[PDB]
Structures are given as structure tokens and as C-alpha cells.
Amino acid sequence: TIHEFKKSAKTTLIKIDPALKIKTKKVNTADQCANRCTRNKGLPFTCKAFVFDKARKQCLWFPFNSMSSGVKKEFGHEFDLYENKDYIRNCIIGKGRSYKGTVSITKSGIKCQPWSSMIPHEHSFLPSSYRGKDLQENYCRNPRGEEGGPWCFTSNPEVRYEVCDIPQCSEVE
Amino acid sequence: NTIHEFKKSAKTTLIKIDPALKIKTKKVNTADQCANRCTRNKGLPFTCKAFVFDKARKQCLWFPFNSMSSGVKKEFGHEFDLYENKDYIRNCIIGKGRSYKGTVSITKSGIKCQPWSSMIPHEHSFLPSSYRGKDLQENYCRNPRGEEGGPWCFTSNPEVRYEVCDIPQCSEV
């Protein structure tokens, strides 16, 4: 089930409201964390994310994620953060400046090109500059808040860039 | 094999009233093959948000829309199963979440929801047929009467009749 989750390398989370529940356990792989999180058995909360400590081989299960109020996102080479997609907002507000979901396909249906690649499209949208924008893998993103909404570079030479088809939160009921 | 990742509605296909919308069909063996192609979006002139498996004609129907889209309606049919891509089912709540259609099925304290169709452990009268439009399917967190706490469910723990589920507001600033 590790694919039900958006992965952020080298990242963990820290609670600042001390009331928020946590649960930890030593395991073998990050796979085993995801399994328990998806199945949500033996957890006295809704599992919205977990971190795998690769050094200690420990799962940390959370009823929050990186968008929750009361938690900080910190760098650490031995951690990978896994966020349950059911809790990463999957619709756009305004022009989608704050979109962080995992849709990686354009409106006319082509797979996006990874931001950290210059073939087949050359560009100046590297992760490093645009920190906080989450230009990760090949996700649809709107780093500058432009009118088109989340968009990407297309893995097809004919089309440089195209918007993605992420619905407005206001679209439906 | 990503079919388990989709929200399934049995005995259901979708019809486009609007002739503008695009559909794509292909003869196949199994519903799992429809899921794979939708998941990966391989060779579709659009973003696949849903598909139907026709068990009689052995066909996939891939759609750039779902049951909540404009100009689309459900149609009953014994041969059809509808599968909706969770990435295009709004996973946050508007106001009290009367119109919530997502698949969260665990309460705030981590308890697996009881199916609406079941009287075990708890007897109740929120029968699906009493509440059409409210999607009282499987064991999903729902707010069929639009009450204060947001979506909830009867609980699979005999000790706890019902509990609210922990589903985030789409926008609250």
C-alpha cells in the first residue's frame, strides 16, 4: 500500500500541540508502516501520515500531516515522510497556488515531465529556487500562481507546457 | 493492480447528455485491465477520472468525468460496474459536509465504521433507501441529515454507537 501515500524524502514532522496522539514501533521496512497505516488497526486515531526512521527502523504514525496546524516539517537524512492521499486536499482554491496533491497528467492526458529534468524540456523551475512550492517528482504545480492553475512540463516535445485538469473545490455540490 | 484504489459503485454506468464530452472504449478481458490503463493514463486523449467495466460486452469505458460532473448522469445496468478515481472525489468537507462523497471509513478515535446496510453492532434507521442522494454506501463517514459535527458513522465497536470522523474542511482561514 506504500503507493496510497505521497513521499517526501529526508523529511519528518514534529508536534507543537502536545495533546496530539502519536504511536511508534520498530519494524523492518517502510512497507510495514504503510500497511498498518492503511489498515489503521491498533491505532487510537485516524492515521493521516507516517514517518519511517531508516536508521532506527522505526515507524512513527500520525493523525496529522504537513498541512495540519500544530506540526513542523524538519529535514533529516534518515527520515522519509509518507502522507495518506485521502488527507491531501485534492481540489484547487483560487488559482491553486497551494496545491500539493499528486496529479501528474495534463488536461489533454500526457504525463508531466519531472521538474528535475531538462529532457525533453529545458526550463528554470528547479526545486532549489522555489522552496516551499513542492516541485517534486512530476506533480502538477502552480509555483507562480498563474491564471492557468497547476500545470507542468509535458513529456512530449510537441507541447511545451499544459495545464492539468484539477477541479476547483467550488465545482461540485 | 490498482482496482482496489477506486471507489466502486455496482450496477452503474454513466451517460453523457452533453455530446461535447469525450469517451474512450476498448474490448478487454477483466475490470483490472481497465483500472491499470486508467491509473497510468496510457493512450487516453484526456485525464481519466472514472471508468466502467461492462461485464456482458467485455468492454472498458474511460471517462474524463465522474458521477459528480456537469452534463453527466448515472444509468442502471446489471452488467456495469463504475469505478471512480479517488483523486477526483473531493476529499475535504464544505461546511457541514452534507455533500461529502469521499471514502474515509474510520472514526476520529480510529474505529472502523459499521456498514450503513448493517444492523450489527448497532440497530438504526439510516437505511440507504431512506436517504437517497446521501450516498449511504459501504461504511463511509457521512452526514446524511447535515448536523453540526460533520460526517460520522455507526461504529464497529459495540461499546460506541457512533462517532464523528476527522475529515478536514476544504477552506477555513
From Swiss-Prot, chain B:
It comes from the Eukaryota. Residues 1-87 form the PAN domain. Disulfide bonds join 34-60, 38-48, 92-170, 113-153, 141-165. Residues 92-170 form the Kringle domain. This is Hepatocyte growth factor alpha chain. It comes from Homo sapiens (Human). The chain holds residues 37 to 209 of 728 of the full protein.
